[PDB]
Protein backbone atom coordinates (compact mmCIF):
# COMPACT_ATOMS: atom_id res chain seq x y z
CA UNK A 1 0.00 0.00 0.00
CA UNK A 2 2.94 2.33 0.69
CA UNK A 3 4.48 1.62 -2.71
CA UNK A 4 1.20 2.22 -4.58
CA UNK A 5 0.89 5.59 -2.82
CA UNK A 6 4.50 6.43 -3.70
CA UNK A 7 3.88 5.43 -7.33
CA UNK A 8 0.78 7.64 -7.52
CA UNK A 9 2.64 10.53 -5.86
CA UNK A 10 5.57 10.19 -8.27
CA UNK A 11 3.29 9.85 -11.31
CA UNK A 12 1.38 13.03 -10.44
CA UNK A 13 4.63 14.82 -9.56
CA UNK A 14 6.34 14.06 -12.87
CA UNK A 15 3.07 14.68 -14.73
CA UNK A 16 2.71 18.21 -13.40
CA UNK A 17 6.47 18.83 -13.66
CA UNK A 18 6.33 18.01 -17.37
CA UNK A 19 3.20 20.18 -17.42
CA UNK A 20 5.05 23.24 -16.13
CA UNK A 21 8.73 22.86 -17.11
CA UNK A 22 7.78 24.37 -20.48
CA UNK A 23 6.84 27.73 -18.87
CA UNK A 24 10.31 29.37 -19.28
CA UNK A 25 10.48 27.98 -22.84
CA UNK A 26 7.00 29.00 -24.04
CA UNK A 27 7.85 32.69 -24.78
CA UNK A 28 10.56 31.71 -27.29
CA UNK A 29 7.93 29.73 -29.25
CA UNK A 30 5.53 32.66 -29.71
CA UNK A 31 8.05 35.52 -30.00
CA UNK A 32 -3.65 46.47 -18.00
CA UNK A 33 -2.04 43.92 -15.70
CA UNK A 34 -4.02 40.97 -17.08
CA UNK A 35 -4.73 40.37 -20.77
CA UNK A 36 -5.75 37.06 -22.32
CA UNK A 37 -3.41 35.41 -24.84
CA UNK A 38 -4.75 33.17 -27.60
CA UNK A 39 -1.57 31.18 -28.23
CA UNK A 40 -0.97 30.58 -24.51
CA UNK A 41 -4.67 29.82 -24.13
CA UNK A 42 -4.37 27.06 -26.73
CA UNK A 43 -1.38 25.55 -24.90
CA UNK A 44 -3.46 25.56 -21.72
CA UNK A 45 -6.62 24.21 -23.36
CA UNK A 46 -5.17 21.42 -25.54
CA UNK A 47 -3.98 19.15 -22.73
CA UNK A 48 -7.07 19.86 -20.65
CA UNK A 49 -9.56 19.22 -23.47
CA UNK A 50 -7.82 15.99 -24.41
CA UNK A 51 -7.66 14.80 -20.79
CA UNK A 52 -11.33 15.66 -20.23
CA UNK A 53 -12.32 13.65 -23.31
CA UNK A 54 -10.11 10.72 -22.30
CA UNK A 55 -11.28 10.59 -18.66
CA UNK A 56 -14.61 8.69 -19.04
CA UNK A 57 -13.02 5.95 -21.16
CA UNK A 58 -10.35 5.33 -18.51
CA UNK A 59 -13.13 5.06 -15.93
CA UNK A 60 -14.82 2.46 -18.12
CA UNK A 61 -11.50 0.84 -19.03
CA UNK A 62 -10.31 0.19 -15.47
CA UNK A 63 -13.43 -1.91 -14.88
CA UNK A 64 -12.51 -4.19 -17.79
CA UNK A 65 -8.78 -4.67 -17.18
CA UNK A 66 -7.97 -3.17 -13.78
CA UNK A 67 -5.77 -0.27 -12.72
CA UNK A 68 -2.09 -1.24 -13.31
CA UNK A 69 -2.29 -1.33 -17.13
CA UNK A 70 -3.72 2.21 -17.49
CA UNK A 71 -1.10 3.51 -15.05
CA UNK A 72 1.69 1.94 -17.10
CA UNK A 73 0.14 3.36 -20.28
CA UNK A 74 0.15 6.77 -18.61
CA UNK A 75 3.86 6.32 -17.95
CA UNK A 76 4.47 5.31 -21.57
CA UNK A 77 2.57 8.30 -22.97
CA UNK A 78 4.39 10.61 -20.54
CA UNK A 79 7.79 9.35 -21.69
CA UNK A 80 6.85 9.67 -25.37
CA UNK A 81 5.57 13.22 -24.81
CA UNK A 82 8.72 14.16 -22.89
CA UNK A 83 10.89 12.89 -25.74
CA UNK A 84 8.78 14.77 -28.29
CA UNK A 85 9.20 18.05 -26.37
CA UNK A 86 13.01 17.87 -26.52
CA UNK A 87 12.89 17.91 -30.34
CA UNK A 88 9.78 20.04 -31.02
CA UNK A 89 11.08 22.92 -33.14
CA UNK A 90 7.57 24.29 -33.78
CA UNK A 91 4.49 25.56 -31.96
CA UNK A 92 2.11 23.06 -33.58
CA UNK A 93 4.13 20.10 -32.32
CA UNK A 94 4.09 21.75 -28.90
CA UNK A 95 0.31 21.50 -29.17
CA UNK A 96 0.57 17.86 -30.32
CA UNK A 97 2.80 16.98 -27.36
CA UNK A 98 0.37 18.77 -25.02
CA UNK A 99 -2.47 16.61 -26.34
CA UNK A 100 -0.41 13.46 -25.78
CA UNK A 101 0.41 14.64 -22.26
CA UNK A 102 -3.33 15.12 -21.78
CA UNK A 103 -3.98 11.49 -22.67
CA UNK A 104 -1.24 10.37 -20.28
CA UNK A 105 -2.51 12.60 -17.48
CA UNK A 106 -6.01 11.21 -17.95
CA UNK A 107 -4.66 7.67 -17.60
CA UNK A 108 -2.41 8.29 -14.60
CA UNK A 109 -4.89 10.54 -12.80
CA UNK A 110 -7.99 8.39 -13.17
CA UNK A 111 -6.45 4.97 -12.56
CA UNK A 112 -4.09 6.18 -9.82
CA UNK A 113 -6.85 7.74 -7.75
CA UNK A 114 -9.03 4.70 -8.39
CA UNK A 115 -6.26 2.43 -7.14
CA UNK A 116 -5.72 4.66 -4.11
CA UNK A 117 -9.44 4.41 -3.31
CA UNK A 118 -9.52 0.63 -3.78
CA UNK A 119 -6.32 -0.05 -1.82
CA UNK A 120 -7.21 2.26 1.10
CA UNK A 121 -10.81 1.30 1.82
CA UNK A 122 -10.84 3.11 5.16
CA UNK A 123 -12.34 6.60 4.95
CA UNK A 124 -9.74 8.35 7.12
CA UNK A 125 -6.87 6.40 5.55
CA UNK A 126 -8.18 7.38 2.12
CA UNK A 127 -8.35 11.04 3.11
CA UNK A 128 -4.78 11.14 4.40
CA UNK A 129 -3.41 9.17 1.44
CA UNK A 130 -5.18 11.33 -1.15
CA UNK A 131 -3.97 14.48 0.59
CA UNK A 132 -0.41 13.20 0.18
CA UNK A 133 -1.08 12.28 -3.45
CA UNK A 134 -2.37 15.78 -4.25
CA UNK A 135 0.64 17.20 -2.43
CA UNK A 136 2.57 15.35 -5.11
CA UNK A 137 0.83 17.40 -7.81
CA UNK A 138 1.63 20.53 -5.83
CA UNK A 139 5.30 19.55 -5.59
CA UNK A 140 5.46 18.89 -9.32
CA UNK A 141 4.05 22.33 -10.10
CA UNK A 142 6.48 23.85 -7.58
CA UNK A 143 9.59 22.18 -8.99
CA UNK A 144 8.75 22.50 -12.69
CA UNK A 145 9.40 26.12 -13.75
CA UNK A 146 12.57 26.78 -11.69
CA UNK A 147 14.17 23.52 -12.86
CA UNK A 148 13.23 24.44 -16.41
CA UNK A 149 14.73 27.92 -16.13
CA UNK A 150 17.99 26.74 -14.55
CA UNK A 151 18.59 23.90 -17.01
CA UNK A 152 17.35 25.91 -20.01
CA UNK A 153 19.70 28.82 -19.39
CA UNK A 154 22.79 27.24 -17.81
CA UNK A 155 22.92 23.84 -19.58
CA UNK A 156 21.03 23.99 -22.87
CA UNK A 157 17.68 24.02 -24.60
CA UNK A 158 17.19 20.23 -24.51
CA UNK A 159 18.70 19.48 -21.09
CA UNK A 160 15.56 19.83 -18.89
CA UNK A 161 13.54 17.50 -21.12
CA UNK A 162 16.29 14.86 -21.30
CA UNK A 163 16.74 14.93 -17.52
CA UNK A 164 12.96 14.72 -17.10
CA UNK A 165 12.91 11.74 -19.49
CA UNK A 166 15.49 9.99 -17.31
CA UNK A 167 13.33 10.68 -14.25
CA UNK A 168 10.26 9.33 -16.07
CA UNK A 169 12.25 6.20 -16.98
CA UNK A 170 13.02 5.72 -13.28
CA UNK A 171 9.30 6.10 -12.54
CA UNK A 172 8.49 3.51 -15.20
CA UNK A 173 11.00 1.06 -13.76
CA UNK A 174 9.42 1.46 -10.31
CA UNK A 175 5.98 0.83 -11.82
CA UNK A 176 7.33 -2.22 -13.67
CA UNK A 177 8.80 -3.78 -10.55
CA UNK A 178 5.84 -3.00 -8.26
CA UNK A 179 2.64 -3.21 -10.31
CA UNK A 180 3.74 -5.85 -12.87
CA UNK A 181 0.95 -4.96 -15.33
CA UNK A 182 1.46 -7.87 -17.75
CA UNK A 183 -1.82 -9.59 -16.78
CA UNK A 184 -5.36 -8.33 -17.33
CA UNK A 185 -7.14 -8.20 -13.95
CA UNK A 186 -10.81 -7.23 -14.30
CA UNK A 187 -12.71 -5.71 -11.40
CA UNK A 188 -14.45 -8.13 -9.05
CA UNK A 189 -17.85 -6.63 -9.92
CA UNK A 190 -19.45 -4.42 -12.56
CA UNK A 191 -19.39 -0.79 -11.48
CA UNK A 192 -22.34 1.56 -11.52
CA UNK A 193 -22.81 3.01 -15.03
CA UNK A 194 -21.58 6.53 -15.66
CA UNK A 195 -25.07 7.78 -16.56
CA UNK A 196 -26.47 6.61 -13.21
CA UNK A 197 -23.63 8.23 -11.24
CA UNK A 198 -24.24 11.50 -13.11
CA UNK A 199 -27.89 11.40 -11.96
CA UNK A 200 -26.77 11.39 -8.30
CA UNK A 201 -27.11 14.92 -6.86
CA UNK A 202 -24.40 14.55 -4.18
CA UNK A 203 -21.73 13.41 -6.63
CA UNK A 204 -22.83 16.42 -8.69
CA UNK A 205 -22.32 18.69 -5.66
CA UNK A 206 -18.82 17.33 -5.07
CA UNK A 207 -17.90 17.55 -8.77
CA UNK A 208 -19.22 21.11 -8.99
CA UNK A 209 -17.25 22.14 -5.91
CA UNK A 210 -14.14 20.63 -7.52
CA UNK A 211 -14.89 22.32 -10.85
CA UNK A 212 -15.72 25.86 -9.72
CA UNK A 213 -12.70 26.04 -7.40
CA UNK A 214 -10.41 25.79 -10.45
CA UNK A 215 -12.23 28.25 -12.74
CA UNK A 216 -10.67 31.46 -11.43
CA UNK A 217 -7.07 30.26 -11.49
CA UNK A 218 -7.70 28.56 -14.84
CA UNK A 219 -8.77 31.91 -16.28
CA UNK A 220 -6.05 33.88 -14.46
CA UNK A 221 -2.87 32.04 -15.45
CA UNK A 222 -3.06 32.38 -19.29
CA UNK A 223 -3.59 36.14 -18.78
CA UNK A 224 -0.54 36.78 -16.58
CA UNK A 225 1.85 39.59 -17.60
CA UNK A 226 4.77 37.13 -17.57
CA UNK A 227 3.88 36.12 -21.14
CA UNK A 228 4.58 39.66 -22.38
CA UNK A 229 7.85 40.11 -24.24
CA UNK A 230 9.41 42.37 -21.59
CA UNK A 231 9.64 39.29 -19.36
CA UNK A 232 11.41 37.31 -22.09
CA UNK A 233 13.78 40.18 -22.87
CA UNK A 234 14.57 41.47 -19.35
CA UNK A 235 12.46 39.97 -16.54
CA UNK A 236 13.10 36.26 -17.25
CA UNK A 237 13.16 35.17 -13.59
CA UNK A 238 9.42 35.85 -13.22
CA UNK A 239 8.70 32.93 -15.56
CA UNK A 240 10.17 30.69 -12.86
CA UNK A 241 8.88 32.56 -9.83
CA UNK A 242 5.27 33.21 -10.89
CA UNK A 243 3.87 29.79 -9.92
CA UNK A 244 5.69 29.38 -6.58
CA UNK A 245 2.96 30.96 -4.36
CA UNK A 246 0.07 28.77 -5.51
CA UNK A 247 2.25 25.65 -5.47
CA UNK A 248 3.51 26.23 -1.91
CA UNK A 249 0.06 27.11 -0.60
CA UNK A 250 -1.62 24.17 -2.36
CA UNK A 251 1.03 21.81 -0.97
CA UNK A 252 0.53 23.05 2.60
CA UNK A 253 -3.26 23.07 2.31
CA UNK A 254 -3.46 19.55 0.91
CA UNK A 255 -0.99 18.14 3.45
CA UNK A 256 -2.76 19.63 6.47
CA UNK A 257 -6.35 19.23 5.29
CA UNK A 258 -6.11 15.62 4.14
CA UNK A 259 -5.81 15.00 7.88
CA UNK A 260 -8.01 17.83 9.12
CA UNK A 261 -11.03 17.48 6.80
CA UNK A 262 -12.22 14.27 8.46
CA UNK A 263 -12.16 15.80 11.95
CA UNK A 264 -13.65 19.14 10.89
CA UNK A 265 -16.01 17.57 8.36
CA UNK A 266 -15.31 17.47 4.64
CA UNK A 267 -18.53 19.38 3.92
CA UNK A 268 -17.33 22.23 6.16
CA UNK A 269 -13.80 21.99 4.78
CA UNK A 270 -15.10 22.29 1.21
CA UNK A 271 -17.47 25.12 2.17
CA UNK A 272 -14.64 27.11 3.77
CA UNK A 273 -12.34 26.35 0.84
CA UNK A 274 -14.92 27.61 -1.65
CA UNK A 275 -15.49 30.78 0.38
CA UNK A 276 -11.75 31.45 0.58
CA UNK A 277 -11.32 30.86 -3.17
CA UNK A 278 -14.17 33.25 -3.92
CA UNK A 279 -12.81 35.94 -1.60
CA UNK A 280 -9.18 35.63 -2.74
CA UNK A 281 -9.95 35.98 -6.46
CA UNK A 282 -12.24 38.92 -5.68
CA UNK A 283 -9.04 40.61 -4.48
CA UNK A 284 -7.32 40.10 -7.87
CA UNK A 285 -9.10 43.08 -9.56
CA UNK A 286 -7.39 45.25 -6.93
CA UNK A 287 -3.88 44.40 -8.12
CA UNK A 288 -2.03 47.09 -10.09
CA UNK A 289 1.29 45.23 -9.82
CA UNK A 290 2.53 41.71 -10.48
CA UNK A 291 3.59 41.62 -6.82
CA UNK A 292 -0.04 42.38 -5.97
CA UNK A 293 -0.95 38.92 -7.27
CA UNK A 294 1.29 37.09 -4.77
CA UNK A 295 -1.08 37.11 -1.78
CA UNK A 296 -4.26 36.30 -3.78
CA UNK A 297 -2.38 33.49 -5.53
CA UNK A 298 -1.28 32.09 -2.16
CA UNK A 299 -4.83 32.24 -0.81
CA UNK A 300 -6.22 30.64 -3.97
CA UNK A 301 -3.71 27.79 -3.88
CA UNK A 302 -4.32 27.14 -0.19
CA UNK A 303 -8.11 27.07 -0.54
CA UNK A 304 -8.02 24.97 -3.73
CA UNK A 305 -5.90 22.39 -1.93
CA UNK A 306 -8.40 22.57 0.92
CA UNK A 307 -11.32 21.87 -1.43
CA UNK A 308 -9.51 19.05 -3.24
CA UNK A 309 -8.46 17.33 -0.01
CA UNK A 310 -12.06 17.58 1.18
CA UNK A 311 -13.76 16.37 -1.99
CA UNK A 312 -11.55 13.67 -3.52
CA UNK A 313 -12.16 11.12 -0.69
CA UNK A 314 -15.91 11.74 -0.67
CA UNK A 315 -16.07 10.65 -4.31
CA UNK A 316 -15.10 7.16 -3.16
CA UNK A 317 -17.21 7.53 -0.02
CA UNK A 318 -20.38 8.33 -1.99
CA UNK A 319 -20.07 5.22 -4.17
CA UNK A 320 -19.26 3.08 -1.13
CA UNK A 321 -22.46 4.46 0.45
CA UNK A 322 -25.08 4.96 -2.28
CA UNK A 323 -23.71 2.83 -5.14
CA UNK A 324 -21.51 -0.14 -6.09
CA UNK A 325 -18.01 0.19 -4.64
CA UNK A 326 -16.07 0.60 -7.90
CA UNK A 327 -13.99 3.73 -8.17
CA UNK A 328 -12.99 4.24 -11.82
CA UNK A 329 -16.02 6.23 -12.99
CA UNK A 330 -16.30 8.55 -9.98
CA UNK A 331 -12.69 9.65 -10.39
CA UNK A 332 -13.25 9.98 -14.13
CA UNK A 333 -16.02 12.41 -13.13
CA UNK A 334 -13.75 14.17 -10.62
CA UNK A 335 -10.97 14.57 -13.18
CA UNK A 336 -13.47 15.84 -15.76
CA UNK A 337 -14.54 18.44 -13.19
CA UNK A 338 -10.90 19.37 -12.52
CA UNK A 339 -9.99 19.62 -16.23
CA UNK A 340 -13.15 21.50 -17.28
CA UNK A 341 -11.87 24.78 -15.87
CA UNK A 342 -8.58 24.68 -17.78
CA UNK A 343 -10.39 23.44 -20.89
CA UNK A 344 -13.10 26.12 -21.04
CA UNK A 345 -11.65 29.10 -19.16
CA UNK A 346 -8.82 29.96 -21.56
CA UNK A 347 -11.52 30.61 -24.22
CA UNK A 348 -14.64 31.61 -22.28
CA UNK A 349 -12.67 33.94 -20.02
CA UNK A 350 -11.11 35.62 -23.03
CA UNK A 351 -14.50 36.12 -24.68
CA UNK A 352 -16.04 37.45 -21.46
CA UNK A 353 -13.08 39.76 -20.80
CA UNK A 354 -13.54 41.13 -24.32
CA UNK A 355 -17.28 41.58 -23.72
CA UNK A 356 -17.50 43.08 -20.23
CA UNK A 357 -13.92 43.21 -18.88
CA UNK A 358 -11.40 41.13 -16.93
CA UNK A 359 -11.95 42.66 -13.45
CA UNK A 360 -15.67 41.98 -13.84
CA UNK A 361 -14.84 38.46 -15.03
CA UNK A 362 -12.85 37.72 -11.87
CA UNK A 363 -15.51 39.44 -9.73
CA UNK A 364 -18.25 37.24 -11.21
CA UNK A 365 -16.14 34.09 -10.79
CA UNK A 366 -15.54 34.90 -7.13
CA UNK A 367 -19.22 35.69 -6.61
CA UNK A 368 -20.12 32.33 -8.18
CA UNK A 369 -17.64 30.57 -5.89
CA UNK A 370 -19.14 32.27 -2.83
CA UNK A 371 -22.70 31.47 -3.94
CA UNK A 372 -21.95 27.79 -4.62
CA UNK A 373 -20.48 27.17 -1.16
CA UNK A 374 -23.79 26.63 0.75
CA UNK A 375 -24.47 23.60 -1.47
CA UNK A 376 -21.75 21.68 0.39
CA UNK A 377 -24.18 21.44 3.33
CA UNK A 378 -26.01 18.69 1.43
CA UNK A 379 -22.88 16.52 1.75
CA UNK A 380 -23.09 16.60 5.56
CA UNK A 381 -25.35 13.52 5.81
CA UNK A 382 -26.17 11.86 2.47
CA UNK A 383 -28.65 8.96 2.64
CA UNK A 384 -27.58 5.38 1.95
CA UNK A 385 -29.04 2.75 -0.38
CA UNK A 386 -32.60 1.52 0.11
Ligand SMILES: COc1cc2c(cc1OC)[C@H]1CC(=O)[C@H](CC(C)C)CN1CC2
Nearest residue numbers: 019020044047141246247250301304342
Ligand atom coordinates in the same frame (compact mmCIF):
# COMPACT_ATOMS: atom_id res chain seq x y z
C1 LIG B 1 1.87 25.59 -18.83
O1 LIG B 1 0.61 24.93 -18.72
C2 LIG B 1 0.02 24.92 -17.49
C3 LIG B 1 0.55 25.52 -16.36
C4 LIG B 1 -0.13 25.45 -15.14
C5 LIG B 1 -1.34 24.77 -15.06
C6 LIG B 1 -1.87 24.16 -16.20
C7 LIG B 1 -1.20 24.23 -17.40
O2 LIG B 1 -1.64 23.67 -18.57
C8 LIG B 1 -2.88 22.96 -18.53
C9 LIG B 1 -2.10 24.64 -13.76
C10 LIG B 1 -1.84 23.29 -13.06
C11 LIG B 1 -2.57 23.23 -11.75
O3 LIG B 1 -3.37 22.36 -11.49
C12 LIG B 1 -2.24 24.33 -10.78
C13 LIG B 1 -3.15 24.24 -9.54
C14 LIG B 1 -2.49 24.47 -8.18
C15 LIG B 1 -0.97 24.45 -8.28
C16 LIG B 1 -2.97 25.76 -7.55
C17 LIG B 1 -2.43 25.65 -11.52
N1 LIG B 1 -1.69 25.75 -12.82
C18 LIG B 1 -0.20 25.77 -12.63
C19 LIG B 1 0.47 26.13 -13.93
